[PDB]
Amino acid sequence: QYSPNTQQGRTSIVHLFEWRWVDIALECERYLAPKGFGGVQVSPPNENVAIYNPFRPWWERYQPVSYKLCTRSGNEDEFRNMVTRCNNVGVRIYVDAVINHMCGNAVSAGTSSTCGSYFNPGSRDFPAVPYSGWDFNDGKCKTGSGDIENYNDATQVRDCRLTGLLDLALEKDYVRSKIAEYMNHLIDIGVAGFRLDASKHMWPGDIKAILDKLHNLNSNWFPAGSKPFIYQEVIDLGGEPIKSSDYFGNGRVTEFKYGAKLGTVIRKWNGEKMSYLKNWGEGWGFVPSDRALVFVDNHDNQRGHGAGGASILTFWDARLYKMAVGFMLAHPYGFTRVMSSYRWPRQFQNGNDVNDWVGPPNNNGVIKEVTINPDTTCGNDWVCEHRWRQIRNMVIFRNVVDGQPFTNWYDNGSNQVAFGRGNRGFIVFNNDDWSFSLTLQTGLPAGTYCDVISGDKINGNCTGIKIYVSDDGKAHFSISNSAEDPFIAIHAESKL
Ligand SMILES: C[C@H]1O[C@H](O[C@H]2[C@H](O)[C@@H](O)[C@@H](OC[C@H]3O[C@@H](O)[C@H](O)[C@@H](O)[C@@H]3O)O[C@@H]2CO)[C@H](O)[C@@H](O)[C@@H]1N[C@H]1C=C(CO)[C@@H](O)[C@H](O)[C@H]1O
Numbered sequence: 001q002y003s004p005n006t007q008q009g010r011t012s013i014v015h016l017f018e019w020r021w022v023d024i025a026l027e028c029e030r031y032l033a034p035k036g037f038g039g040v041q042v043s044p045p046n047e048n049v050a051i052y053n054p055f056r057p058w059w060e061r062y063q064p065v066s067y068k069l070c071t072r073s074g075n076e077d078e079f080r081n082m083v084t085r086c087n088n089v090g091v092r093i094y095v096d097a098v099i100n101h102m103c104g105n106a107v108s109a110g111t112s113s114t115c116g117s118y119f120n121p122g123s124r125d126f127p128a129v130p131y132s133g134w135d136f137n138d139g140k141c142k143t144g145s146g147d148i149e150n151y152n153d154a155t156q157v158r159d160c161r162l163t164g165l166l167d168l169a170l171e172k173d174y175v176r177s178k179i180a181e182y183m184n185h186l187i188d189i190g191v192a193g194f195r196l197d198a199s200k201h202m203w204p205g206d207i208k209a210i211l212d213k214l215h216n217l218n219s220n221w222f223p224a225g226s227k228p229f230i231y232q233e234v235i236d237l238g239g240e241p242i243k244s245s246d247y248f249g250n251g252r253v254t255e256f257k258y259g260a261k262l263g264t265v266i267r268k269w270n271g272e273k274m275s276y277l278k279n280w281g282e283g284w285g286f287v288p289s290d291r292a293l294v295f296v297d298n299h300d301n302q303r304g305h306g307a308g309g310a311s312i313l314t315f316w317d318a319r320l321y322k323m324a325v326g327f328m329l330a331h332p333y334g335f336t337r338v339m340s341s342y343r344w345p346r347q348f349q350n351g352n353d354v355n356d357w358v359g360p361p362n363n364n365g366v367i368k369e370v371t372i373n374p375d376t377t378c379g380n381d382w383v384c385e386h387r388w389r390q391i392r393n394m395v396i397f398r399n400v401v402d403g404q405p406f407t408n409w410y411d412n413g414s415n416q417v418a419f420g421r422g423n424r425g426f427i428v429f430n431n432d433d434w435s436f437s438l439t440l441q442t443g444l445p446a447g448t449y450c451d452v453i454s455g456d457k458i459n460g461n462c463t464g465i466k467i468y469v470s471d472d473g474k475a476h477f478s479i480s481n482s483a484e485d486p487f488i489a490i491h492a493e494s495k496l
């Protein structure tokens with residue numbers, strides 16, 4: 001459960017948040033595969049509640065109605081088409097599995113679902129699965145409201161409703177079997193793994209029982225005995241009785257402390273400085289690297305919805321965001337996930353975004369297609385951070401330096417640091433309010449290297465900054481605190 005199952009040499013997955021299956025299929029072939037991306041995390045592919053008030057919010061997708069592969073992203077045929085085309089190009093698909101609950105208990109009964117399925121929350125009836133009152137934890141939860149009221153009580157966190165969402169009785173073999181039936185349908189289709197949504201709200205033992213019911217990956221694309229990659233979303237910033245280490249026996253876990261701390265350091269909040277990143281990793285109290293799924297921001301905290309708070313960096317903070325993603329992709333700790341979002345009209349009031357519910361770009365509720373501009377950026381309000389030169393080139397950087405050790409660290413005791421990955425790559429950062437001009441040991445073989453942040457290596461020439469490494473591995477770096485991107489990265493494959 002701990003191996004990504006990506007093609008050898010591809011080290012990152014990208015979250016194409018709210019994308020349509022047809023657009024992802026095209027993206028696998030025209031961009032992801034050629035640029036070395038390992039895989040894609042897709043939004044929940046199962047039928048969800050169609051919410052009109054507010055108008056089709058992104059979060060309606062986390063309120064399951066059935067396990068039919070029928071959503072605003074497409075139907076089952078389009079989904080299977082996407083998985084097949086992506087796999088044939090070496091790009092894996094990871095499914096966001098919402099298995100802890102069904103929709104909100106206060107949702108009106110009827111057929112306001114993305115596939116017309118009938119459901120009645122009030123009487124606990126979901127005939128399309130089917131589930132009945134016997135399949136929920138209503139009689140097991142002990143809070144007066146029936147919802148989770150206190151995260152200091154590890155029991156109610158698991159047996160009660162997360163903000164009203166009907167909680168499935170995951171201890172019952174019947175329920176475990178319906179969930180496995182759903183996941184095995186996907187595995188046999190060709191998915192390589194899953195993001196287990198709201199894992200903190202499920203007992204580690206119940207999750208394991210479900211995982212034991214899973215098939216090995218489809219033998220038409222994966223070697224015999226391959227097990228699906230599992231990463232569990234468990235928000236553990238300390239201070240709570242539930243620890244992410246309790247879930248190590250099932251697979252990897254999301255390390256939310258990662259983005260939170262990187263954000264405060266790069267923003268230079270309360271005395272924090274980049275020189276402190278010298279021992280970044282377990283040294284900061286993070287989970288073991290081989291159990292970590294890291295990221296700068298996720299679909300939740302980029303809109304102030306999960307954990308991370310005000311320190312989280314997003315595409316809105318473009319300049320600092322590229323630097324944070326750059327550091328993440330160059331550093332050896334964990335398995336990296338790149339975020340890819342859409343723009344929404346943020347409207348802050350008393351420090352809060354009242355439009356944090358806004359769903360993906362659409363026309364009368366129909367999600368807009370991802371259009372590609374002549375300069376390779378996206379239109380129709382899709383941000384496509386994974387297509388930004390600075391981010392795309394660092395995804396390649398991680399591939400090139402994969403396996404290389406963290407070495408040749410340098411820092412000015414403030415916010416100017418640098419380090420290399422074996423003799424395959426080197427990166428320099430300047431986050432101080434003054435210029436950086438120094439000769440450093442890179443550990444790289446002599447030659448002329450193209451800086452992959454400012455430009456590209458276009459066969460024989462660099463479109464941006466060029467770095468010259470001498471015979472002893474030394475090279476001069478000059479970065480003004482006024483540079484568009486205050487950092488430089490060079491690697492074995494950007495050499496001339
Ligand atoms: C939306 C997510 O809500 C829940 O997350 C909790 C988190 O578990 C809890 O610890 C706390 O963390 C914030 C932070 O606040 C500080 O004041 C404390 O000092 C820290 O110790 C504390 O960690 O609050 C958040 C927000 O309620 C769920 O646990 C998490 O699973 C939810 N995210 C996923 C689930 C659903 C439901 O299907 C989706 O809506 C969402 O898109 C998923 O990512």
Ligand SMILES: *[C@@H]1O[C@H](CO)[C@@H](O)[C@H](O)[C@H]1NC(C)=O
Pocket residue numbers: 459460461
């Ligand atoms: C680099 O570009 C110049 C023109 O700007 C050209 O003269 C030269 O041949 C190019 N180098 C290679 C290796 O193609």
Ligand SMILES: [Ca+2]
Pocket residue numbers: 100157158159160167168201202
């Ligand atoms: Ca639960």
Ligand SMILES: [Cl-]
Pocket residue numbers: 195233254298
């Ligand atoms: Cl996540």
